[PDB]
Amino acid sequence: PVKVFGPAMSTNVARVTLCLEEVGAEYEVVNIDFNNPFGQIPAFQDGDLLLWESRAISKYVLRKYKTDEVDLLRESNLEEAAMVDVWTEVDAHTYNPALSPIVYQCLFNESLEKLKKVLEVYEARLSKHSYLAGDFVSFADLNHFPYTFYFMATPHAALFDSYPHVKAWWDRLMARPAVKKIAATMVPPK
Amino acid sequence: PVKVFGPAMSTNVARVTLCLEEVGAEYEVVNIDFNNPFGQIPAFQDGDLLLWESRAISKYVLRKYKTDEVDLLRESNLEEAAMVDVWTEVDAHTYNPALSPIVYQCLFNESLEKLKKVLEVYEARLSKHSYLAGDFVSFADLNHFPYTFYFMATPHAALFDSYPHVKAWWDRLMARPAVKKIAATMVPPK
């Protein structure tokens, strides 16, 4: 059984726990307090192996537990793997940064016009394909879950109704058993 | 022959051209002017395939042209691939951002104390291993080339002399024939 160290509700921990659930790995989430050379969270233990960097942890999980039924990187198919990589990068560089300040300014404390231009592109893409990388769910889709989840707790949630293919894609991810399981974990400690 | 569209000297184009040279692919670099749905540069054509996102382009290049002698992702070995991923992410999230404002404030126009703390970590890592992911060159090392190249044009270049293992690792990358070739291309158009 592998161990994830960090807060359950953080977007970087939820990205790893979502990957562990999609592949059906046995794992434990452990809270750690600061009181792994850059001392980052999440950290990840598998036997003597210690990893950090949410995306590197996630890919290790998706490769280690890969099957014919759950192949979420598609590394056996050059062009599928490329489309998974492209939309993973779009999530990191374009999408998550368009969401982030709406989430932060709405749940604590102009970005709407930039997000709409991004959703136009997603709407075109999800009109031609079931999921971002093609006609199969992949890491690219799962990477969109944690930030969109919090965006859907804001008063801007309904913005997705103007992008019917994006709304349908979002609802489809939200129906996945692994996504429902990780949604329920994304709460402050009790 | 594949085509890379963008400025030769940009860090994101040089990352792709360095990968194409390390695998010995036939390619052409094409300048494009704005006068690929988010219209990003570099863009990449391989037959009917059009890609964007420097890192996704790079990985497609490293997989398409992979051999026994030039395996720069190590996707066949779970833990090696994980260490390549970890240090690729360290480059994106920690290293390149520590260099960037030193490069920008020195060649145009506090970050030194943060860079030193990062170089301490790199020095420890490169004391135990030849290269960042283990005893083999990988994408993780190549990702460090473009920004470090520009950092070495600043008056802070000599900072690496305080980190002898980092200096030796840097000199070793600079001696690679592919790196020398791409260093020479990183000039303004003539």
Residue numbers in the entry:
A (entry chain AAA), B (entry chain AAA): 3 to 37, 50 to 123, 138 to 218
What's in the article?
Recombinant AmGSTF1 has been shown to exhibit both glutathione-S-transferase activity toward xenobiotics, as well as acting as a GPOX, reducing fatty-acid hydroperoxides to less reactive monohydroxy derivatives. The Phi (F) class GSTs, of which AmGSTF1 is an example, are found in all higher plants, being homodimeric enzymes in which each protomer of approximately 23–30 kDa with the catalytic serine residues located at the interface.
The hexagonal modification contained one protein chain in the asymmetric unit, whereas the rhombohedral form had six independent molecules with a very similar packing arrangement of trimers composed of the functional GST dimer. All polypeptide chains adopted virtually identical overall structures, with rmsds ranging from 0.2–0.4 Å on Cα-atoms.
